[PDB]
Design a protein around this nucleic acid. Sequence first.
RNA 1: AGUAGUAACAAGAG
RNA 2: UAUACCUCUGCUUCUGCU
RNA 3: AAGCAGAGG
Lengths: 743, 250, 701
Amino acid sequence: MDVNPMLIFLKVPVQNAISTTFPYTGDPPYSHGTGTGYTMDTVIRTHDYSSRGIWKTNSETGAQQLNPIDGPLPEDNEPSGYAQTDCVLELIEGLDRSHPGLFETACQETIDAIQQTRVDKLTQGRQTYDWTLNRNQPAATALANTIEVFRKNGYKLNESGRLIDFLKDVLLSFENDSMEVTTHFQKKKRIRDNHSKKMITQRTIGKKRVKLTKKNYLIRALTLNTMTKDAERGKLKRRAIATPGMQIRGFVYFVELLARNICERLEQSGLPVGGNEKKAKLANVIKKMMAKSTDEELSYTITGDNTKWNENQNPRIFLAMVLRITAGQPEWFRDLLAVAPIMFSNKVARLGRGYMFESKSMHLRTQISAENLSDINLRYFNEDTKKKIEKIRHLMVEGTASLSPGMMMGMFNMLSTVLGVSVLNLGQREILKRTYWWDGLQSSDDFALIINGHFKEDIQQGVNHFYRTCKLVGINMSQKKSYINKTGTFEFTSFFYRYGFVANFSMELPSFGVAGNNESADMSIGTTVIKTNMINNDLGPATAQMAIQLFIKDYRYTYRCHRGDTNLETRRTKSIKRLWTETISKAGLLVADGGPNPYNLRNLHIPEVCLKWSLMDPDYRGRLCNPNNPFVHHMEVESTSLEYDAVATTHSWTPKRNRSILNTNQRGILEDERIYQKCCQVFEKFFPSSTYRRPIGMASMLDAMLSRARIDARIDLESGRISSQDFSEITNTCKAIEALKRQ
Amino acid sequence: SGMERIKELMEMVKNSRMREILTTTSVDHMAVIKKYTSGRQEKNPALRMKWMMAMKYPISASSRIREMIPEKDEDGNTLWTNTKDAGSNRVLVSPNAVTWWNRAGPVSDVVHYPRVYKMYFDRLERLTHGTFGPVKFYNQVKVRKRVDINPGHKDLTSREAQEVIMEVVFPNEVGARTLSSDAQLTITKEKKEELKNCKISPIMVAYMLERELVRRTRFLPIAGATSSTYVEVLHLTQGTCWEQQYTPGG
Amino acid sequence: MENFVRTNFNPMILERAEKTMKEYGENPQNEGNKFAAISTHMEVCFMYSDFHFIDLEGNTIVKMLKHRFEIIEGQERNIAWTIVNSICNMTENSKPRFLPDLYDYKTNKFIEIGVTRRKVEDYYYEKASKLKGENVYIHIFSFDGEEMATDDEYILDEESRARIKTRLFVLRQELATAGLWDSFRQSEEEEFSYPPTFQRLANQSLPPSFKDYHQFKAYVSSFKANGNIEAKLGAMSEKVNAQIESFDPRTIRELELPEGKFCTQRSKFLLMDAMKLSVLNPAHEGEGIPMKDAKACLDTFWGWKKATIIKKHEKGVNTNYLMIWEQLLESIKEMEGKFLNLKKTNHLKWGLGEGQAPEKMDFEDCKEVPDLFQYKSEPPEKRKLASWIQSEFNKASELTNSNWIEFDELGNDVAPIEHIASRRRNFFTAEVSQCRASEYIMKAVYINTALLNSSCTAMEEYQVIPIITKCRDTSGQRRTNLYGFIIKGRSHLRNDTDVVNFISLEFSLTDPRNEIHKWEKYCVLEIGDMEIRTSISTIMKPVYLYVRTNGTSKIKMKWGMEMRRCLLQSLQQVESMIEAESAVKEKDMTEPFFRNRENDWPIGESPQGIEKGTIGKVCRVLLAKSVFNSIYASAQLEGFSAESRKLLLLIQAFRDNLDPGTFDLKGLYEAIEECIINDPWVLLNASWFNSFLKAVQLSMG
RNA sequence: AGUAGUAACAAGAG
RNA sequence: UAUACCUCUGCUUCUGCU
RNA sequence: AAGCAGAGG
Ligand SMILES: O=c1ccn([C@@H]2O[C@H](COP(=O)(O)NP(=O)(O)OP(=O)(O)O)[C@@H](O)[C@H]2O)c(=O)[nH]1
Ligand SMILES: O=C(O)c1cn(CC2(n3ccc4cccnc43)CCCC2)cc(O)c1=O
Ligand SMILES: [Mg+2]
Ligand SMILES: [Mg+2]
Ligand SMILES: [Mg+2]
Ligand SMILES: [Mg+2]
Ligand SMILES: [Mg+2]
């Protein structure tokens, strides 16, 4: 007998055993090496779906820009980016007519949130393309470098602390013809490694001042650096992601804030709801569309995706949508929300790290960057890269590729959701006035579309009408990834429906394990993961007990904290055995201290220190929860040396961090981080709430610290807590500090 | 007193780079310059903890552990070593030092864990004196409602409770706003009288008051009652085909 | 204006007024009368505050003392609110609703100071109407000379008030002589514009029938819908349509599997062909040390002979593999210690890939090289499905006589649902712990854990890692099993996809000549002879050693260490199939499922037809499926699963009488068959889907 | 050689 | 020259180490 | 309030 697991679907429905179709126990596919080929594929597919447009040379950057808007109508079912702006404006006008007061309320909330947003909101991002260093940095580092270069060049509106003044500085910096930035250059020396007697290259990173031109600064300000997405499930081929710089992210934040305020009040939107709220919204839409019918009414659901969603959106369509939604608003608000589609219409894509080249007669390999890829003869590339470069060459501008159509991966999620929700909103039966109508839900490119009609020909006419109306606005439905059946079963962002949403436990399977923080946080993380999967993802109680057992196994093997009566030998066996022997009540010892596991089903919501607190020895609980804990951080006592008492146990320690680059001296650029940390630590002594809540203020740190020191000295003098000579010495120290900052 | 911090500011203002930073960075821009990093970032901490616990010193703690924890064990294990910089504020620690502190460190008669995490002890007291009924098997109709996972206070909302916490713990940095309610003033007076001469760090005090006062809500599938004492045991009382009859303590 | 204000006032007053206008958003080079008024208010507050001290007694001495007034005006607003909050928290006063100008420590009063060009009584009543409800002291000054305090009660001395009145009178007369006094009494919006470079950028971000950004903005602001969608749909071709093709699984074809050579074994260890040297109840001098347990297992086999190459690795040097095994056995026979690092010989350097990378140099030094060619990115060669992987999956779903998974202790069961879960978990453990896939889990977890620890601790050493598992019998006795050895290469792993090479040498009793296409990557030697005692007879079978060079990465070792999640993927599904029954019968259906072998679930395909099994067989089959998903993880499997899930849902929607339809089934078949290249598990899953489709077609007749 | 798959690792910037 | 954006869920309050 | 982790698009 040959064993076939897929024959379990003869007896069980597919949705009731859908977790067997997710092979999520193995490693996900990763990308090896560069992502330059995927970036070139993205640019070639973006210029191929828009190829019947107008080519214009930009007068500011010199980039070849392709305009497919109001081009020829599509003649086939291939993906097209020829969105008609009049149909887009008609759909947004119908969306405003179906929801009176929606756009005005969303614009009013966006105006209220523009006046309150600060610059450090831009530190919410992750890896940001830094135009000063021509590489990716964290968002706070790239923002601090941008602000330092703007203040060194004379753009100091961002000293007010508001985001909109930083955006004014961004738009005013384009008038500078010579931007003086600080880069990171590299010195190399051939030393000898003593561990292997081998000659290596020792790299020393320093700082260097360089002058950018006007066009080079404008190309760097419109640059999206492109990587490749790693650990992506469900795909065979890889694709490229993109990150913008700091000159784009504030405007993109404001546009996405407005589009989020629009999407929060639309019933046919899948954003920004998620989890159980999105499932309840889908179930309510399906119940309203399945109940509101007659005796002879047919209802069909399309589970629908879209082919190349980010490639076929257009920033000019987003500009028209922004200018139509903000109708009647003040013109500064319209211009501020119009900047980001204008910046994305003139965007460029950094091709990445280039490619690796190999010489076999010399037996060497070398990484040639993208900026040096244009000066290589075509016979040195392989066939696919040669075809890519021959298609790419006319779009090259200073190491980057011009990309005027497209929006790239996930840059305008909510605005594209608004564009899809308008096509969903068109199919109201009191407006369409036909034999068919449609409802449903849209989330980015995923859609569940319910067409109701009287015959199957009416359903076919409704599907054709929705498909052609989506084709009018640059939305290309994937004909090989979408399907249609009767209403009662569909799929929406890997949520499977069969008269109610079924569970998919395998998707939450990588969350079961050891998180890797310390011994205290990981136990609570594991127990709460098991509890949350019992609540939400239909994890059965026997499998939950098995998950508790496997987590205790993984936790004891990860931190080497096996029980005191075990025979395994690690580096921690003797001390844990010593703690096990001299403990009377061994049930009160933690699992990290070699104690037994106390968790069953009923107590997963209770932490381990509290659950074992009544079973501990007083000596063990006095050592474990000692307020003189040397493993954690102790805050210094404020002016109201001596430190505060620690609450957390000794298992809340800090793991050792390693930030070293191989054969690289980084001490020339690691200095200012330490000086920033010293300045923040000396600020926290005067303002003890700065770690709990973000402090605000336009004055400098030194002025705030001196004013706080003076007022605290005066209050402590006027309360019997400090002497008069101490007050005089504090005020004389503040006066000498004020004298030091002027001479 | 307040003279040591201003003399440390005097020592730091003599350095020209520190003076330029303290005179050109605002309080708003300190949130930007605080998260400033320069080297490479450590990704995938789970795998890093998998291989790093096999090494000799995976823990980094302060220098005061050289005065609280000895260098050697009774078995001969090295508990801490210094780094490659003479006079740093950080040394490299072995987990045998954690085990030595848990088996032979200084015993403290006072602990702050039952006071700071009093909500979890309330949960344990609610579970221990609970009553379990029989398990009944039938198809559960779970409605994904929005229920409270933290009840908070009966008279406060979330923002009012956060303003009460900011008034109690950090009264000199509340800014321009004032407590515009009577329940805010009464709870502020009571929590200020309860927290006098408290040697707990103020951030831990603020998070204890945040667990006590701020109401939290989540979207959960509910088959039975929606009270917050039943939301905390939602994994225990209901599933997909069964229902555990349970009455909490109190 | 601006020049008079700089010619009169001190630089402290000008700096305070400039910082106040920078805080509120103005400039002295534009607004001049407001700058002069802010400077005048600042100088009046400074004259009110200066030369007023409090000595050690407490009375106001006018000249080492302390100031009588705290200046709140001129500070930044958060600094000023910090000062006001600290003052209100020192005393017992209520917080003022606005920021006042001074604080008097002697009178303990907040002071609001106003300098007006109008009349004193009118401005005083206006500021009292603005500041009503609190005890803020109000004092109003004017350029005429008159004043009005709070209820005509003064707290300042007459000399200081006379100096303030004299200064305001002199400033008023100098404004009269300067000709700027007429503009002062008469004076008693968010903006965002485009700079011209960004304006020229805005003019090029439009639809191509527009030349200016403001023209397009006026077009969008004045747009009315007049049937543009209906006209554009009447103008568009009829070829652009979403025609629904009806889905019928009786009419669809099967998946087209690729052709070529047969698929090859690519696991990191042997599976059905693995032999283990075992010690029963170990109690030697290092029961727990891996190399000592390996030597204790090697000292149970006495049939060693001279190793001969009986199956060559066709792409490699097989004498190097022979010398590697000779060096490994000789170094084990003379090993002293708890670990073993092999000497870096030439054959071991060949087998571990030492020096195979080209030397990485910078492009600035490699410009004159006349033969720099790009790395080739060729697609993988297609392979035909062979029948060994079905035999592997058949053997992996079988019960063994050994318990391979030990589970940790739980808490005590108090709730009745905990007792129900304990009974169901005991049934799951009785059906799943004696499985061959559980042994594969333990082998993979041990190999990946030891390889990761050795790769991160001994990066330059050629460490020997034995393949050791530990199991219990059906009576409860311990048994330590050795499957072979792993020689780790150099492991300077920086990227997550960086490959550490190793050499795996696994014991076997399987002749590779009977299925040589399974072993393209292996070099199989004949190392021994074992007396195999069978039931009918007793023969002497040769013991082979399968030797191959393999490689792994840190993410692959990370996911190999977490293969026990496979136990979570199977037993969550089976329990759901229990619970979906338990909601129907209104009782716990665990014991009717496990204690009544009625053979209910289809899992097999015989020549007689479709075979059914019990629920524990389903447990073992789903466990083996999760284990083989974890072992043979690739991008082909991910793409094939994600693209064949849609066809499974289409077949299910047909069986639910929901009338399924597609829009491009040919493109769906192309997307499925694109992901079927050379992995044997993906080929086996494609054949499994074809068998399921044929069974669905035979079910509908 | 091997890992592997549209480009890399097979040490010398992660 | 190197882990993007958006949303949801969960945990912690971290003082930075070649 | 922020950071980290997981999932989805
Ligand atoms: O990891 C992700 C996944 C999806 N997305 C965003 O979600 C959009 C749709 O998500 P998608 O998965 O459907 N990708 P798509 O571009 O439509 O190509 P395909 O369906 O294969 O023909 C994409 O175009 C991205 O904009 C991301 O930004 N990051
Ligand atoms: O800011 C205050 O508290 C304050 C402000 N005025 C209004 C004017 N003024 C003076 C400084 C200042 C700063 C910002 C806005 N208006 C400001 C007075 C002259 C022109 C306007 C008057 C007082 O008497 C005050 O006490
Ligand atoms: Mg799509
Ligand atoms: Mg999608
Ligand atoms: Mg004032
Ligand atoms: Mg005033
Ligand atoms: Mg090769």
